[PDB]
């Protein structure tokens, strides 16, 4: 195993700094340099810079020089990217990446991205509302169930059904942003034998305000 | 009553010429001739060659200054031939650029080399070097206000220091022989730049002419002070070059930025500092000779009406041209502001030789036009024509070395035309100028107690 | 005009103006004396120069070893009077030295038939040797002679009775100094028992003759500790070694091999070399030859090349010849045993013409290291300039400062230098003058923006910049 | 810096077929000294990190299926997939590694073509808990169709609704290559009270007539 991992989500009020953080595992941390890359939506990847854990030297693209600041902590295998003066157009996903050879830039191992949103609008935990078919529900052999997620913030909310057990036949629709709050919905389809007979829950989860909620889909 | 009296005896006339020829040049310029000659043999030949060329030129000025006894020297000889405007265009460049830059440059060489043994391995502090240049220029324009006998006793002293330093250099050279031609850049295009880079070290031989009018006996002593000096200089130069080649290898002279100091380090050890100090005191002599001579050029320029009348005035109890001196000092110190300086002189590489060529062309035309004018010296016409022909070639070489910079110089010469038309052709007609000119003039006369000279 | 004589005198007389003239006299002299005190103040309250450390000839630039006079020349001409012909080349390389690989009468593995004093007559006569040596003095190339005893054999000190062999050397050094050589090379000191003691004796013999003679030891070793032990007791010994040889073969270790060794020795004098005998091209792959020549000429210490390093000679390129002694390629004739195998660009003649050639880089660097006070004996400060880069500044008290930037890794940089943590005395400028690059297509002489510079893979730069008070 | 143009920006292709990405660099990425070409291809599936496919133009990473073949030299480079699987829909980026900092292409969106299929349409009356809020949201799900183009009519007691309607499509499902879409209508409680019959009807190119679902509160 080699595995980098990162915090899920960060909200930044415009102009403030943020720390994005990346813990390595599965290798001798000082042997390999750590790179930070970014992905602006609809605009392609961009590389920030890299840091050497053996002496804290770091090298940065011309676009980030002085705007970024990498450091490192050898005691925990953690690398930290500080970013500063963040504007709305610096909202992005920030990825921590490891090289193959000692510093050369091609990236076999990436951490799952930290989604950085830059907005003055406040953190807002989600409101979850289950959906059940109502009239003529059991007249068909397969039945669909749903979970509206409304008025939440920031962007990353996750849905899994029955604690990830119903990983087959789930559709979760991308979020819609309205009046500076997000709306999303998730859906699953099960045998008509299952739904009235068994537990069904959308296990909605929100990294940026720590709320975890398991609404049961109960008939009308 | 009041005039510039005839103070300059023959040996002081030899001081004014040897003091301003020997310069800084021989102690730092050998490198320039080896760069274009390659070979100690070809080098030591072009040193002799531009020596005899310089003697031939000086013999034309030894003629001219007995035919025309005015102290305008190189300027007067143009005025008496080409008339008002050509003479002014010279005096403007001399006033604005050549004399104050020259005076400053050589003072800064005085400052740096006199300080150098406190700072052997590194730069002498620049804010100290510019003060010690300014203290020098200020002191010598004080001395040349106090008495021409003091001025010429100063240049006797420092002309002696210079030749003593070269004798010491030559002697150690022969001592090194007593203790027991090469690869030549034989292209004519190399040789000509060797010769043209060597002629700078003789530049100065015309300076006696600007003090013709203060010689005790000009018709004898002005040609004699030339012939008593330039052959002496030429000998001392070829012997001094010979001395360096006994001690510094060609590679070392091609790559040492103060040739005499390396020769000092090799021979004198703990006492090496003597040679830097002699290069310094050597340059002091050249500032004095230049300030002296230069004050007379502007004096004459004002007497002939080319230049504002205050500069003609003399101090009655000391008989020194105090407003011309004071002007010359101030115009020198105004070059102390400039972050670069040699460039402004390099713009006029051609100008010295051009004026010399025009003077001796003048001497040809003056022999055709007025054979009846008195001539205690009458040189065989071969020498003037040879010397002219040679200068017209060197003027072209001076351009061909850097065709941009001689163009910049030629552009600045035309700055003389605005000033000539405003200062001479316009007759200063507006009363708000004319009354202010007068008011300023009478203030200066009052302020330092000076009066016009009497014919 | 203005006032007449009489008119000016009568008005000037007024006590007010007489006092004004007296005031301004006094004022002027006061101002000049103020300036004199001021300039004396500046001269005293200003930083002094640092005394130049006394420099033996071997500080002043590169040595140059000739392990076999025959292989350097081609046969027949393979004698000392042949070498006397070549010194104009060497003088063009600006090599302040030579090392003639052993010329003494050695019979292979025979301790008794070998002598270190009589020369092996194949190479000429002592009358030739002196003729050379006097020419070399005349041309400013000091000459060292190599005294390693059994040089035609397997083990250079023989297997047996080593104290008799050391006794041969002890006598030899005296004779050859009296003959007028400037120093001695000895090799394979890992094959010498009690090595440190014999080096100490021979060093004492040499310095006891005169202060301007040296003993160059050499070892097959690449161990930092073994080398530091041979350099412990002997303090003005150059000791060439394999220590830089194990470079990682895309340079990657070198920033670290070099800065450990400087640190460990305490920045004494050193001799950089990739070996005691073999060519640079015995170790380096040929994209790094330029990059190493930039580095060997600009570290603190006396670099050392084997013959033909200056042209990137390689024993493998013309097959069959021994890796001990490859035939030097002067011109297209020089290896006639397989004619047509020599390309023009592989030869001295073929490089001498071409500003891009390896020998045009060697010649150029040799100049800088032998004239510029900063490379001649300045300090050295490494710093982290960039990912691959080994980068460092050479400097001396106020003279020109030289930043070297070697891109050892195979990936170009696209984002400038970006120096972390320079010494406060040695801070980088905003821009510096490119004095040369390892690569073509550069604006040599021009100032570069260090924050926006772009090195190619393997591009080294030599930047020159002026001092700051 | 170097710049990498990439094309086409979209590459819709059918399962089993061969496909080609082009990448085009503003300098050469052949290293003369070493005779290899510095480029890499990364696949980024929807909702995941980049995975490295090939580097130095051709060298497959371990754990990469051998249907990815990379090729080219100088400045014309191509990643090819010999026989596209349903699991391969992604954005693909080229990256140079001839200089650090590196730079990337704007990426090719691979899309899958399949036999067209009509949406499963379902409509969900407002959640009884939501009715506490003073608002209500009616939701219509359209599942497992192809191609992406679709439209929805909301009818409320027969009146057509065009204010306060929102839509979201999924990215195309890697198991079956179908799209799905959610449509949402948000009402005040009193706006949900005053009207009785709610209809979602969907027009998709597989049927002349719209598909319909509805409920009466
Ligand atoms: N037209 C013109 C005329 C003169 C006056 O004539 C010369 C004198 Cl007065 C002295 C020297 C140098 C002297 N021979 C020495 O040894 O330093 C050369 C010339 Cl051309 C100039 O001087 C200089 C000069 C003098 C000292 C340092 C640097 C430059 N530039 C000149 C340009
Ligand atoms: C070696 O030389 C040093 C002086 O450089 C001296 O102190 C020492 O006694 C000498 N030893 C021998 C044995 O010559
Ligand atoms: C160096 O010499 C030692 C001792 O003979 C030997 O063991 C070692 O292998 C040698 N190494 C090289 C690189 O010649
Ligand atoms: C080597 O360099 C380090 C740099 O921090 C220094 O602390 C150390 O004293 C030096 N010397 C040795 C022998 O490690
Ligand atoms: C020299 O020229 C040859 C022939 O064109 C070429 O193959 C080679 O790469 C060049 N370089 C060297 C060092 O041989």
3 state SS of C191 = helix
Our CA angle for B256, B261, B262, nearest 5°, is: 55
Q: Nearest by CB to D99, which of C287, C411, C458?
A: C411
Mark yes or no for CB contact C387/A55 under 8 Å. Answer: no
- Could you tell me if D90 and D52 are in contact, meaning their C-beta atoms sit under 8 angstroms apart? no
Backbone angles phi, psi at D161, to 5 degrees: -110, 130
| Closest approach atom of ligand 2 to CA C200 | 1
Which A-chain residues 112-131 have CB contacts (< 8 A) with chain D?
112-113, 127, 129-131
- Closest residue in chain C to residue D31, using alpha carbons only: C457
CA distance C447 to B293: 44
Interchain pair A62, C452: CB under 8 A: yes
User: Closest Cα of chain C to B53: distance in Å?
Assistant: 36
Asked whether the beta carbons of A121 and A11 are under 8 A apart, the reply is: no
Nearest Cα of chain C lies from the Cα of A161 at a distance, in angstroms, of 47
Residues of C in contact with A102 (CB under 8 A): 252
Nearest CA to ligand 5 atom 11: C345
- Cβ partners under 8 Å of residue C424, min gap 6: none
Q: Whose CA is nearest to atom 10 of ligand 2?
A: C204
Decide: C109 and C153 in contact? Cβ < 8 Å: yes
> Which of A106, A112, A189 is most worth mutating to test chain D (most D CB atoms within 10 A of its CB)?
A106
* Whether C282 contacts C307, CB under 8 Å: no
In the 8-state DSSP scheme, what is residue A124?
A: B
Distance separating alpha carbons of residues D182 and A184, to the nearest angstrom: 9
Q: Regarding beta strands A170-178 and A142-152, do their DSSP bridges make them parallel or antiparallel, or are they unpaired?
A: unpaired
CA–CA distance, C381 with C368 (Å, rounded to integer): 18
Q: Report the neighbours of B using a cutoff of 3 or more CB pairs below 8 angstroms.
A: C
- What phi-psi label fits residue B427: left (phi over 0), alpha (psi between -120 and 50 degrees) or beta? left
Q: Does D10 contact chain C (CB < 8 Å)?
A: no
Tell me, in angstroms, the distance from the centre of ligand 4 to residue C381's CA: 14
Ligand 1 centroid vs B203 CA: distance in angstroms? 5
Alpha carbon of C221 to ligand 3 centroid (Å)? 7
Q: Which ligand is nearest to the CA of B205?
A: 1
Binary contact (A150, D137; C-beta < 8 A): yes
Alpha helices in B68-115, H assignment, sequence order: 76-82, 84-93, 99-115
**Beta carbons of D124 and D138 less than 8 angstroms apart:** yes
Q: Of A62, A113, A187, which is closest to D141 when you measure between CB atoms?
A: A187
| List of chains touching D (3+ CB pairs within 8 A) | A, C
Sorted by sequence, the CB contacts under 8 Å of residue C253 that are 6+ apart come out as: C246, C247
Of D41, D5, D55, nearest to D26 by C-alpha is D5
For residue B324 the two structure tokens come to 């011309």
CB atoms within 10 A of CB C164: 11
Bridge partners for C406 per DSSP: C390
Distance from CA of B21 to the nearest CA of C (A): 29
Q: How much distance in Å is there from the Cα of C460 to the middle of ligand 5?
A: 22
**CB of A24 closer than 8 Å to CB of A4:** yes
d(CA C392, CA C344): 36
**D104 → closest Cβ in A44, A130, A132:** A44
Structural method: cryo-EM
Q: Say yes or no: D176 contacts chain A, CB-CB below 8 A.
A: no
What is the token pair recorded at B300?
């004459």
Can chain C be said to touch chain A, i.e. do they have 3 or more Cβ pairs within 8 angstroms? yes
CA torsion sign for A144, A149, A155, A156 is negative
Q: Which of C143, C350, A148 is nearest to D141 (CA)?
A: A148
Closest chain C residue by Cα to residue D97: C411
Q: Is the CB of C264 under 6 A from ligand 4?
A: yes
| Angle, in degrees to the nearest 10, between helices B84-93 and B349-369 | 150
Residues B396 and C292: their CA atoms lie apart, in Å, by 48
C358 lines ligand 5 (CB under 6 A): no
Q: Do A45 and D95 touch (CB under 8 A)?
A: yes
Please, which chains are in contact with C (at least 3 CB pairs closer than 8 A)? A, B, D
Report the gap between the CA of C389 and the closest CA in chain A (Å).
12
In this structure, which ligand is nearest to the CA of C316?
Answer: 5
Give A-chain residues touching C452 at CB under 8 angstroms.
62
Is the shortest distance between the CB of C228 and ligand 4 below 6 Å?
Answer: no
User: Do residues B59 and B204 touch, judged by C-beta distance below 8 A?
Assistant: no
Spacing of C-alpha A73 from chain mean position: 24
Grouping H, G, I as helix, E, B as strand and the rest as coil, residue D39 is strand
**Range C102-107, long-range pairs (CB < 8 A, 24+ positions):** C102/C145, C102/C146, C102/C147, C102/C148, C102/C151, C103/C69, C103/C129, C103/C145, C103/C146, C104/C147, C104/C149, C104/C172, C106/C149, C106/C150, C106/C151, C106/C152, C106/C153, C107/C152
| Alpha-carbon gap, residue C181 to B376, rounded angstroms | 69
Chains that touch A (3 or more CB pairs under 8 A): C, D
User: How far separated are the first and last CA of chain D, in Å rounded?
Assistant: 62
For residue C417, the CA-to-ligand 4 centroid distance in Å is: 25
Coil, strand or helix at B11: helix
Atom of ligand 4 minimally distant from the CA of C264: 13
C249 lines ligand 5 (CB under 6 A): no
Ligand nearest to the backbone CA of C317: 5
**DSSP string over C193-231:** TTHHHHHHHHHHHHHHH-TT-EEEEE-S---HHHHHHHH
Contacts of B232 (CB under 8 A, 6+ apart): B18
List the single residue in D93, D102, D125 with the smallest CB-CB distance to A105. Answer: D102
- A48 touches A64 (CB < 8 A): yes
Q: Which residues contact B376 (CB under 8 A, 6 or more apart)?
A: B66, B219, B220, B223
Rounded Cα distance between C85 and B53, Å, is: 42
Task: Give the whole-angstrom CA distance, residue C426 versus residue C382.
Answer: 11
Closest listed ligand to the CA of C277? 3
On the 0-12 / 13-18 / 19+ scale of CB atoms within 10 A, C266 is exposed
Q: Give residue numbers after which chain C breaks (C–N above 2.5 Å).
A: none
State whether residue C397 is helix, strand or coil.
coil
**Which residue of C lies nearest to A56 if distances are taken between CA atoms?**
C420
Tell me, in angstroms, the distance from the centre of ligand 2 to residue C208's CA: 8
Residues from chain D that touch C412, judged by Cβ atoms under 8 A, are: 98-100
A106 interaction partners in chain D (CB closer than 8 Å): 40, 52, 55, 95, 97, 102
């Amino acid at each position: 195993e080699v595995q980098l991992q990162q915090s899920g989500a960060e909200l930044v009020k415009p102009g403030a700094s943020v720390n994005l953080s990346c813990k390595a595992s599965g290798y001798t941390f000082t042997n390999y340099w750590m790179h930070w890359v970014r992905l602006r939506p609809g605009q392609g990847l961009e590389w920030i810079g890299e840091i050497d854990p053996s002496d804290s030297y770091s090298y940065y693209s011309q676009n980030f020089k002085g705007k970024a600041t990498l450091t490192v902590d050898q005691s925990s295998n953690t690398a930290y990217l500080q970013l500063t003066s963040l504007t709305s157009e610096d909202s992005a996903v920030y990825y921590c990446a490891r090289g193959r050879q000692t510093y050369y830039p091609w990236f076999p191992y990436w951490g799952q991205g930290t989604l950085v949103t830059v907005s003055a609008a406040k953190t807002t935990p989600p409101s979850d509302y289950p959906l059940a078919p109502g009239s003529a529900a059991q007249t068909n052999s397969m039945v669909t169930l749903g979970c509206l997620v409304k008025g939440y913030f920031p962007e990353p909310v996750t849905v899994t059904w029955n604690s990830g057990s119903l990983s087959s036949g789930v559709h979760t629709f991308p979020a819609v942003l309205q009046s500076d709050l997000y709306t999303l919905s998730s859906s699953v389809t099960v045998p008509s034998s299952t739904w009235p007979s068994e537990t069904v829950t959308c296990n909605v989860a929100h990294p940026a305000s720590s709320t975890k909620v398991d609404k049961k889909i109960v008939p009308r | 009553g009041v005039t510039l009296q005839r103070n300059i005896t023959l040996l002081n006339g030899v001081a004014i010429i040897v003091g301003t020829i020997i310069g800084s040049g021989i102690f730092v310029t050998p490198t320039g001739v080896l760069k274009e000659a390659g070979s100690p043999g070809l080098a030591l030949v072009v040193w002799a060659a531009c020596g005899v060329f310089s003697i031939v030129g000086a013999l034309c000025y030894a003629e001219l200054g007995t035919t025309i006894s005015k102290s305008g020297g190189d300027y007067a000889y143009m005025l008496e031939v080409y008339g008002s405007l050509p003479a002014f265009l010279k005096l403007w460049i001399e006033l604005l650029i050549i004399r104050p830059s020259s005076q400053y440059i050589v003072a800064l060489v005085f400052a740096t080399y006199l300080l150098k043994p406190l700072f052997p391995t590194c730069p002498v502090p620049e804010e100290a070097a510019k003060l010690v240049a300014c203290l020098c220029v200020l002191l010598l324009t004080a001395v040349n206000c106090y008495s021409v006998k003091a001025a010429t006793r100063v240049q006797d002293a420092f002309a002696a220091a210079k030749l003593l330093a070269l004798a010491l250099i030559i002697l150690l050279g022969f001592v090194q022989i007593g203790k027991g031609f090469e690869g030549t850049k034989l292209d004519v295009g190399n040789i000509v730049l060797a010769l043209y880079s060597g002629l700078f070290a003789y530049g100065g031989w015309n300076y006696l002419n600007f003090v013709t009018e203060e010689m005790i006996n000009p018709y004898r002593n002005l040609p004699l002070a030339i012939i008593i000096s330039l052959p002496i200089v030429t000998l001392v130069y070829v012997l001094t070059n010979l001395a360096y080649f006994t001690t510094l290898s060609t590679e070392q002279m091609l790559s040492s930025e103060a040739v005499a100091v390396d020769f000092g380090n090799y021979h004198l050890g703990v006492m090496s500092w003597i040679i830097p100090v002699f290069v310094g005191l050597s340059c002091f002599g050249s500032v004095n000779g230049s300030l002296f001579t230069s004050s007379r050029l502007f004096f004459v320029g004002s007497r002939e009406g080319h230049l504002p009348s205050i500069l003609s005035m003399i101090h009655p109890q000391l008989l020194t041209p105090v407003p011309s001196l004071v002007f010359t000092c101030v115009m020198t110190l105004l070059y102390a502001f400039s972050k670069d300086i040699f460039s402004v002189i390099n713009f006029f590489s051609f100008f010295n030789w051009l004026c010399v060529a025009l003077a001796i062309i003048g001497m040809i035309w003056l022999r055709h036009r007025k054979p009846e004018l008195e001539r205690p010296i009458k040189v065989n016409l071969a020498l003037p024509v040879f010397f002219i022909l040679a200068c017209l070639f060197l003027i072209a070489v001076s351009f061909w070395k850097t065709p941009v910079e001689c163009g910049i110089g030629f552009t600045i010469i035309l700055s003389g035309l605005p000033v000539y038309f405003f200062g001479v052709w316009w007759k200063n007609k507006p009363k708000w100028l004319l009354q202010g000119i007068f008011s300023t003039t009478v203030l200066c006369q009052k302020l330092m107690q000076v009066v016009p000279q009497e014919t | 005009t203005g006032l007449s004589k009489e008119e000016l005198l009568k008005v000037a007389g007024s006590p007010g103006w007489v006092r004004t003239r007296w005031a301004l006299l006094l004022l002027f002299w006061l101002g000049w004396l103020g300036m004199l005190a001021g300039a004396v103040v500046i001269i005293v309250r200003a930083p002094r120069c640092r005394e130049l450390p006394a420099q033996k000839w071997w500080h002043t630039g590169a040595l140059y070893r000739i392990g076999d006079l025959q292989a350097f020349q081609g046969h027949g001409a393979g004698n000392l009077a042949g070498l006397k012909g070549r010194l104009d080349y060497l003088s063009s390389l600006k090599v302040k030295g030579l090392v003639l690989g052993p010329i003494h009468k050695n019979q292979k593995d025979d301790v008794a038939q070998t002598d270190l004093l009589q020369i092996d007559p194949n190479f000429g006569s002592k009358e030739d040797f002196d003729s050379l040596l006097q020419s070399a003095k005349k041309k400013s190339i000091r000459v060292i002679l190599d005294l390693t005893p059994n040089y035609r054999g397997e083990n250079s000190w023989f297997s047996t009775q080593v104290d008799t062999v050391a006794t041969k050397v002890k006598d030899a050094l005296e004779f050859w100094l009296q003959a007028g050589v400037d120093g001695f090379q000895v090799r394979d000191i890992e094959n010498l028992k009690d090595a440190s003691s014999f080096l100490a004796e021979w060093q004492n013999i040499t310095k006891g003759f005169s202060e301007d003679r040296l003993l160059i030891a050499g070892t097959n070793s690449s161990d930092l500790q073994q080398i530091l032990s041979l350099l412990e007791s002997n303090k003005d010994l150059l000791l060439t070694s394999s220590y830089l040889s194990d470079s990682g073969s895309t340079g990657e270790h070198t920033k670290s091999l070099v800065t450990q060794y400087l640190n460990a020795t305490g920045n004494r004098w050193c001799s950089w070399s990739l070996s005691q005998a073999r060519l640079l091209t015995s170790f380096l792959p040929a994209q790094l030859l330029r990059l190493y020549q930039l580095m060997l000429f600009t570290l603190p210490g006396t670099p050392v090349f084997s013959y033909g390093d200056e042209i990137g000679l390689d024993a493998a390129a013309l097959p069959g010849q021994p890796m001990e002694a490859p035939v030097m390629l002067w011109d297209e004739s020089s290896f006639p045993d397989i004619p047509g195998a020599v390309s023009a660009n592989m030869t001295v003649k073929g490089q001498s013409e071409d500003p891009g050639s390896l020998l045009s880089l060697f010649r150029r660097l040799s100049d800088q290291r032998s004239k510029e006070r900063s490379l001649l004996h300045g300090d050295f400060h490494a710093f982290s300039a960039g990912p691959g880069l080994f980068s460092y500044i050479r400097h001396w008290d106020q003279n020109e400062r030289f930043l070297v930037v070697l891109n050892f890794g195979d990936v170009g940089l696209s984002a400038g230098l970006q120096a972390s943590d320079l010494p406060a005395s040695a801070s980088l400028p905003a821009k510096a003058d490119l004095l040369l690059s390892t690569q073509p297509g550069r604006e040599e002489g021009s100032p570069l923006e260090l924050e926006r510079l772009k090195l190619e893979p393997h591009e080294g730069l030599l930047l020159r910049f002026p001092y700051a008070a | 810096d170097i710049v990498l143009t990439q094309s086409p920006s979209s590459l819709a292709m059918s399962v089993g077929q061969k496909v080609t990405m082009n990448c085009k660099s503003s300098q050469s990425l052949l290293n003369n000294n070493n005779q290899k070409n510095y480029l890499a291809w990364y696949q980024q599936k929807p909702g995941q990190s980049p995975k490295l496919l090939v580097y130095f133009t051709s060298t497959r990473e371990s754990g990469v299926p051998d249907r990815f073949i990379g090729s080219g030299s100088g400045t014309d480079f191509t990643l090819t997939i010999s026989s596209v699987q349903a699991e391969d829909l992604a954005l693909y980026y080229c990256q140079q590694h001839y200089t650090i900092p590196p730079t990337f292409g704007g990426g090719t969106k691979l899309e899958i073509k399949r036999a067209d299929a009509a949406p499963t349409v379902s409509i969900f009356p407002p959640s009884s808990e939501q009715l506490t809020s003073g608002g209500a949201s009616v939701v219509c799900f359209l599942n497992n169709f192809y191609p992406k183009d679709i439209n929805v009519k909301w009818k409320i007691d027969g009146s057509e609704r065009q204010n306060g309607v929102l839509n979201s499509w999924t990215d195309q499902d890697s198991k079956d290559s179908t799209y799905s879409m959610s449509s949402t209508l948000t009402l005040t409680k009193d706006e949900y009270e005053r009207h009785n019959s709610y209809t979602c009807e969907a027009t998709h190119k597989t049927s002349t007539s719209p598909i319909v679902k509805s409920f009466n509160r």
